[PDB]
Design an enzyme around this catalytic site. Structure first.
Site, PDB file in Angstrom:
ATOM      1  N   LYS B  13       0.629  -1.306   0.037  1.00 11.28           N
ATOM      2  CA  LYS B  13       0.118   0.046  -0.126  1.00 11.28           C
ATOM      3  C   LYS B  13       0.842   1.277  -0.032  1.00 11.28           C
ATOM      4  O   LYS B  13       0.429   2.260  -0.759  1.00 11.28           O
ATOM      5  CB  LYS B  13      -1.012   0.177   1.353  1.00 11.28           C
ATOM      6  CG  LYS B  13      -2.071  -1.210   1.215  1.00 11.28           C
ATOM      7  CD  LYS B  13      -3.188  -0.699   2.429  1.00 11.28           C
ATOM      8  CE  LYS B  13      -2.717  -0.748   3.598  1.00 11.28           C
ATOM      9  NZ  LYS B  13      -2.594  -2.418   4.041  1.00 11.28           N
ATOM     10  N   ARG B  88     -10.925  -0.876   7.376  1.00 13.24           N
ATOM     11  CA  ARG B  88     -10.155  -2.422   7.361  1.00 13.24           C
ATOM     12  C   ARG B  88     -11.139  -3.145   8.126  1.00 13.24           C
ATOM     13  O   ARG B  88     -10.925  -4.256   8.763  1.00 13.24           O
ATOM     14  CB  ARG B  88      -8.559  -2.414   7.720  1.00 13.24           C
ATOM     15  CG  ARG B  88      -8.400  -1.949   9.322  1.00 13.24           C
ATOM     16  CD  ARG B  88      -6.936  -1.574   8.975  1.00 13.24           C
ATOM     17  NE  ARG B  88      -5.818  -2.605   8.736  1.00 13.24           N
ATOM     18  CZ  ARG B  88      -4.615  -2.235   8.281  1.00 13.24           C
ATOM     19  NH1 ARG B  88      -4.102  -1.066   8.299  1.00 13.24           N
ATOM     20  NH2 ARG B  88      -4.006  -3.125   8.081  1.00 13.24           N
ATOM     21  N   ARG B 127      11.798  -5.568   5.536  1.00 11.92           N
ATOM     22  CA  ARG B 127      11.402  -4.197   5.219  1.00 11.92           C
ATOM     23  C   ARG B 127      12.606  -3.134   6.155  1.00 11.92           C
ATOM     24  O   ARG B 127      12.481  -3.446   7.424  1.00 11.92           O
ATOM     25  CB  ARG B 127      10.046  -3.861   5.428  1.00 11.92           C
ATOM     26  CG  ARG B 127       9.745  -2.220   5.168  1.00 11.92           C
ATOM     27  CD  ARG B 127       8.357  -2.027   5.316  1.00 11.92           C
ATOM     28  NE  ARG B 127       7.548  -2.330   6.675  1.00 11.92           N
ATOM     29  CZ  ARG B 127       6.293  -1.921   6.900  1.00 11.92           C
ATOM     30  NH1 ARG B 127       5.600  -1.372   5.940  1.00 11.92           N
ATOM     31  NH2 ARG B 127       5.582  -2.590   7.855  1.00 11.92           N
ATOM     32  N   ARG B 160      10.676  -1.231  11.434  1.00 12.23           N
ATOM     33  CA  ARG B 160       9.339  -0.794  12.323  1.00 12.23           C
ATOM     34  C   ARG B 160       9.346  -2.176  13.323  1.00 12.23           C
ATOM     35  O   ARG B 160       9.676  -3.067  13.304  1.00 12.23           O
ATOM     36  CB  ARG B 160       8.229  -0.683  11.286  1.00 12.23           C
ATOM     37  CG  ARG B 160       7.273   0.295  11.417  1.00 12.23           C
ATOM     38  CD  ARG B 160       6.199   0.365  10.712  1.00 12.23           C
ATOM     39  NE  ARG B 160       5.187  -0.337  10.765  1.00 12.23           N
ATOM     40  CZ  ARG B 160       3.920  -0.619   9.741  1.00 12.23           C
ATOM     41  NH1 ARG B 160       3.935   0.302   8.758  1.00 12.23           N
ATOM     42  NH2 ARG B 160       3.108  -1.543  10.054  1.00 12.23           N
ATOM     43  N   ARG B 171      -0.846  -9.564  13.043  1.00  8.10           N
ATOM     44  CA  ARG B 171      -1.228  -8.704  11.878  1.00  8.10           C
ATOM     45  C   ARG B 171      -1.791  -9.314  10.765  1.00  8.10           C
ATOM     46  O   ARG B 171      -2.802  -9.166  10.210  1.00  8.10           O
ATOM     47  CB  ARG B 171      -0.216  -8.012  11.530  1.00  8.10           C
ATOM     48  CG  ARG B 171       0.305  -6.564  12.448  1.00  8.10           C
ATOM     49  CD  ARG B 171       1.856  -6.135  12.093  1.00  8.10           C
ATOM     50  NE  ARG B 171       1.594  -5.527  10.818  1.00  8.10           N
ATOM     51  CZ  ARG B 171       2.607  -5.194  10.245  1.00  8.10           C
ATOM     52  NH1 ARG B 171       4.109  -5.676  10.684  1.00  8.10           N
ATOM     53  NH2 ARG B 171       2.629  -4.774   8.887  1.00  8.10           N
TER      54      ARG B 171
HETATM   55  N1  LIG Z   1       5.873  -5.341  -5.688  1.00 11.25           N
HETATM   56  C1  LIG Z   1       6.572  -5.544  -4.559  1.00 11.25           C
HETATM   57  N2  LIG Z   1       7.454  -6.622  -4.698  1.00 11.25           N
HETATM   58  C2  LIG Z   1       8.511  -6.869  -3.822  1.00 11.25           C
HETATM   59  N3  LIG Z   1       8.542  -6.165  -2.614  1.00 11.25           N
HETATM   60  C3  LIG Z   1       7.535  -4.999  -2.410  1.00 11.25           C
HETATM   61  C4  LIG Z   1       6.823  -4.792  -3.568  1.00 11.25           C
HETATM   62  N4  LIG Z   1       6.166  -3.718  -3.229  1.00 11.25           N
HETATM   63  C5  LIG Z   1       6.609  -3.447  -1.884  1.00 11.25           C
HETATM   64  N5  LIG Z   1       7.575  -4.283  -1.577  1.00 11.25           N
HETATM   65  C6  LIG Z   1       8.444  -4.073  -0.392  1.00 11.25           C
HETATM   66  O1  LIG Z   1       7.381  -4.865   0.748  1.00 11.25           O
HETATM   67  C7  LIG Z   1       7.459  -4.073   2.058  1.00 11.25           C
HETATM   68  C8  LIG Z   1       6.154  -3.887   2.216  1.00 11.25           C
HETATM   69  O2  LIG Z   1       5.695  -2.782   1.489  1.00 11.25           O
HETATM   70  P1  LIG Z   1       5.026  -1.552   1.856  1.00 11.25           P
HETATM   71  O3  LIG Z   1       4.718  -0.593   0.753  1.00 11.25           O
HETATM   72  O4  LIG Z   1       5.512  -0.797   3.140  1.00 11.25           O
HETATM   73  O5  LIG Z   1       3.497  -2.201   2.367  1.00 11.25           O
HETATM   74  P2  LIG Z   1       2.230  -1.712   3.216  1.00 11.25           P
HETATM   75  O6  LIG Z   1       1.047  -2.454   2.546  1.00 11.25           O
HETATM   76  O7  LIG Z   1       2.166  -0.350   3.033  1.00 11.25           O
HETATM   77  O8  LIG Z   1       2.494  -2.410   4.792  1.00 11.25           O
HETATM   78  P3  LIG Z   1       2.298  -1.862   6.094  1.00 11.25           P
HETATM   79  O9  LIG Z   1       2.831  -2.595   7.071  1.00 11.25           O
HETATM   80  O10 LIG Z   1       2.670  -0.723   5.950  1.00 11.25           O
HETATM   81  O11 LIG Z   1       0.878  -2.214   6.284  1.00 11.25           O
HETATM   82  P4  LIG Z   1      -0.235  -2.557   7.424  1.00 11.25           P
HETATM   83  O12 LIG Z   1      -1.518  -2.658   6.847  1.00 11.25           O
HETATM   84  O13 LIG Z   1       0.394  -3.749   7.950  1.00 11.25           O
HETATM   85  O14 LIG Z   1       0.109  -1.406   8.675  1.00 11.25           O
HETATM   86  P5  LIG Z   1      -0.280  -0.086   8.955  1.00 11.25           P
HETATM   87  O15 LIG Z   1       0.827   0.529   8.879  1.00 11.25           O
HETATM   88  O16 LIG Z   1      -1.091   0.335   7.872  1.00 11.25           O
HETATM   89  O17 LIG Z   1      -0.872  -0.373  10.117  1.00 11.25           O
HETATM   90  C9  LIG Z   1      -0.167  -0.481  11.376  1.00 11.25           C
HETATM   91  C10 LIG Z   1      -0.863  -1.121  12.682  1.00 11.25           C
HETATM   92  O18 LIG Z   1      -1.848   0.439  12.637  1.00 11.25           O
HETATM   93  C11 LIG Z   1      -3.175   0.022  13.203  1.00 11.25           C
HETATM   94  N6  LIG Z   1      -4.071   0.442  12.185  1.00 11.25           N
HETATM   95  C12 LIG Z   1      -3.717   1.119  10.978  1.00 11.25           C
HETATM   96  N7  LIG Z   1      -4.988   1.394  10.415  1.00 11.25           N
HETATM   97  C13 LIG Z   1      -6.159   0.815  11.107  1.00 11.25           C
HETATM   98  C14 LIG Z   1      -7.370   0.966  10.967  1.00 11.25           C
HETATM   99  N8  LIG Z   1      -8.016   1.527   9.968  1.00 11.25           N
HETATM  100  N9  LIG Z   1      -8.066   0.365  11.978  1.00 11.25           N
HETATM  101  C15 LIG Z   1      -7.721  -0.162  13.180  1.00 11.25           C
HETATM  102  N10 LIG Z   1      -6.313  -0.331  13.191  1.00 11.25           N
HETATM  103  C16 LIG Z   1      -5.498   0.230  12.325  1.00 11.25           C
HETATM  104  C17 LIG Z   1      -3.131  -1.653  13.231  1.00 11.25           C
HETATM  105  O19 LIG Z   1      -2.961  -2.067  14.715  1.00 11.25           O
HETATM  106  C18 LIG Z   1      -1.925  -1.955  12.467  1.00 11.25           C
HETATM  107  O20 LIG Z   1      -1.515  -3.243  12.784  1.00 11.25           O
HETATM  108  C19 LIG Z   1       8.713  -3.130   1.960  1.00 11.25           C
HETATM  109  O21 LIG Z   1       9.795  -3.416   2.407  1.00 11.25           O
HETATM  110  C20 LIG Z   1       8.627  -3.072   0.376  1.00 11.25           C
HETATM  111  O22 LIG Z   1       9.721  -2.474  -0.107  1.00 11.25           O
HETATM  112 MG   LIG Z   2       2.038   1.382   4.800  1.00 14.28          MG
END
Ligand SMILES: Nc1ncnc2c1ncn2[C@@H]1O[C@H](COP(=O)(O)OP(=O)(O)OP(=O)(O)OP(=O)(O)OP(=O)(O)OC[C@H]2O[C@@H](n3cnc4c(N)ncnc43)[C@H](O)[C@@H]2O)[C@@H](O)[C@H]1O
Ligand SMILES: [Mg+2]
Ligand SMILES: Nc1ncnc2c1ncn2[C@@H]1O[C@H](COP(=O)(O)OP(=O)(O)OP(=O)(O)OP(=O)(O)OP(=O)(O)OC[C@H]2O[C@@H](n3cnc4c(N)ncnc43)[C@H](O)[C@@H]2O)[C@@H](O)[C@H]1O
Ligand SMILES: [Mg+2]
Ligand SMILES: [Zn+2]
Ligand SMILES: [Zn+2]
Lengths: 216, 216
Positions: B13, B88, B127, B160, B171
Site C-alpha cells: 500500500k 479495514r 522491510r 518498524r 497482523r
Molecule cells: N511489488 C513488490 N515486490 C516486492 N517487494 C515489495 C513490493 N512492493 C513493496 N515491496 C516491499 O514490501 C515491503 C512492504 O511494503 P509497503 O509498501 O511498506 O507495504 P504496506 O502494505 O504499506 O505495509 P504496512 O506494514 O505498512 O501495512 P499495514 O496494513 O500492515 O500496517 P499499517 O501501517 O497500515 O498499520 C499498522 C498498525 O496500525 C493499526 N491500524 C492502521 N489502520 C488501522 C485501521 N483502519 N483500524 C484499526 N487499526 C489500524 C493496526 O494496529 C496495524 O497493525 C517493503 O519492504 C517494500 O519495499
Molecule cells: Mg504502509
C-alpha cells in the site's frame, strides 16, 4: 425536430447522436452523460445517482424525469432536441409525453438502434472514452489513430467505470426487461422507427439521415 | 479522484501510494502513519493506539473513524484523497460511507492489492524504512544503494517495531479475517478492483495507473 434515441447498452446511441447534432444542430441530451457529469462534479444529484449507476441499475424515475424536465426547458431546446437514453421505461415515456405537451414540443420519432444483445458485451469491454470531450472509440471497431488518445483533442482515453464485466451484465439484464414494453408503447403511438445498428457506423447513420432529412 | 487502497499487511500500500501521490498530488492518508506519528509525539491518541499496534491488533473503530473523518475534511482533500489502510473493518467502511456522503466525496475505486499471505512475512521482516522521509526499502526486493541509508536524503533506515515474526503473524491473522467481508462490501457497492501485487513494483503500478485515467 424532437427526437429520442433508444437502444440496449452499447448499441451506439452516443456514436449516432454525435453525427446527428453536427448535421442538424439540436442539443444532444444524454441522461447517462448528465449523471456522470454530476458524479464528476460531486453534486448531490451525482451522489444519489452513483449508487445505482455503479451497479448497473436504473436511477429512480422521479429524479431522472426531473433532470430531463429541467434540461428540456432550456432555450437551446427551442428548435428541437435529441434525447439519448431517456426515456428508457414506459413510465418515463408517459411522463415525457406530459412534459412535451406543456413545452409544446411533442416527439417526432423515436429511433430504436437494434443490435443483438449477444454482441454488446464486446462493444462495451472494448470501449475507450475521451476524458476531454466524451467521444467514444473501440479498440477494434473504431480505434483512435494514436492508442490511448483522442483524435480530436489529444485527450487521454479511459474506460468507463460501469464498463466492467459484472456491471455490463447487469446493465444488459436491467435494460432488456424495460425494452419490449417501451417498444410497444412507441409502436402503438406509431412513431417508433427501428434501425439496424449492427452495421458500419456510416451505414447506420445513412439510414438515420434518410429519416431526419424529412424533418427540417 | 477519491481512492481507497486495501491489502494484507505488507502487500504494498505505501509503495503504490507513494507513486500515486507523485503522479496525482492527492493527499496520502495512512491510518498507520497517523497512529505512529501520534506515538512519536506521545499524544494521548498515540499512547492509546500504541497498545494495539505493538501487539498487531486493530485500534478500536471509534477513535480510528474519528481521526479519519477530521482528516478528510481538510482543504487538501478538495480534489481527492488516497486512503491507505482504512477502512479495514465493515463497521469502518459503513462509517466512511456516511462521512463521504456528508462531505459529498464518494469513493471512485477501492483498489485491493492482492498478495498471497504466504509471502508477506518475508516482505515485512525484510522491510527497512527511512527515519527521515518514511519511504520503504526491502533488503532483497528493493534495497537501498548504500546499506542502512536512504537513497533520497541520506537518512538512517530502521526496522518498524511491529515487523517482527510474532506481531506480523498477529497482523496477518487479524486482517485476514476482515478481508472477505470488506471485499464483499465493496464488490456490492460496485467499485472494488483487484490488482495483482505479486509483480515488480512498476508493473503493479502500471495496472494501478490504468484505473486512474478519467478521474477529474
Ligand atoms: N511489488 C513488490 N515486490 C516486492 N517487494 C515489495 C513490493 N512492493 C513493496 N515491496 C516491499 O514490501 C515491503 C512492504 O511494503 P509497503 O509498501 O511498506 O507495504 P504496506 O502494505 O504499506 O505495509 P504496512 O506494514 O505498512 O501495512 P499495514 O496494513 O500492515 O500496517 P499499517 O501501517 O497500515 O498499520 C499498522 C498498525 O496500525 C493499526 N491500524 C492502521 N489502520 C488501522 C485501521 N483502519 N483500524 C484499526 N487499526 C489500524 C493496526 O494496529 C496495524 O497493525 C517493503 O519492504 C517494500 O519495499
Ligand atoms: Mg504502509
Ligand atoms: N433514463 C434513465 N433512467 C434511469 N437511469 C438512467 C437513465 N439514463 C441513464 N441512466 C443511468 O446511467 C447509466 C448508463 O447510462 P448510458 O450512458 O445512457 O448507458 P447506456 O444506455 O448503456 O449506453 P452507452 O453509453 O453505454 O452506449 P451507447 O449506446 O451510447 O453507445 P456508444 O455510442 O458509446 O457505443 C458503444 C461502443 O461501441 C462502438 N460502436 C458504436 N457504433 C458501432 C458500430 N456501428 N459498430 C461497431 N462498434 C460501434 C463505440 O465506439 C463504443 O466503443 C446507468 O448506470 C443508469 O442507471
Ligand atoms: Mg452513450
Ligand atoms: Zn476527445
Ligand atoms: Zn528518506
Amino acid at each position: 425536430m424532437n427526437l429520442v434515441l433508444m437502444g440496449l447498452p452499447g448499441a451506439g446511441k452516443g456514436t449516432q447522436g454525435e453525427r446527428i447534432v453536427e448535421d442538424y444542430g439540436i442539443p444532444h441530451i444524454s441522461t447517462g452523460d448528465m449523471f456522470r457529469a454530476a458524479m464528476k462534479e460531486e453534486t448531490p444529484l451525482g451522489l444519489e445517482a452513483k449508487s445505482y449507476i455503479d451497479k448497473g441499475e436504473l436511477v429512480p424515475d422521479e429524479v431522472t424525469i426531473g433532470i430531463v424536465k429541467e434540461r428540456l426547458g432550456k432555450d437551446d431546446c427551442e428548435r428541437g432536441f435529441l434525447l439519448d437514453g431517456f426515456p428508457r421505461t414506459v413510465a418515463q415515456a408517459e411522463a415525457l409525453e406530459e412534459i412535451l405537451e406543456e413545452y409544446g414540443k411533442p416527439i417526432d420519432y423515436v429511433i430504436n438502434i437494434e443490435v443483438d444483445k449477444d454482441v454488446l458485451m464486446e462493444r462495451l469491454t472494448g470501449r475507450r472514452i475521451c476524458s476531454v470531450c466524451g467521444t467514444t472509440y473501440h479498440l477494434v471497431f473504431n480505434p483512435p489513430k494514436t492508442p490511448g488518445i483522442c483524435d480530436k483533442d489529444g485527450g487521454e482515453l479511459y474506460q468507463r467505470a460501469d464498463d466492467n464485466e459484472e456491471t455490463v451484465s447487469k446493465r444488459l439484464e436491467v435494460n432488456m426487461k424495460q425494452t419490449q414494453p417501451l417498444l410497444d408503447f412507441y409502436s402503438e403511438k406509431g412513431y417508433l422507427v427501428n434501425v439496424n445498428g449492427q452495421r458500419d457506423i456510416q451505414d447506420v447513420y445513412a439510414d438515420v439521415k434518410d429519416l431526419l432529412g424529412g424533418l427540417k
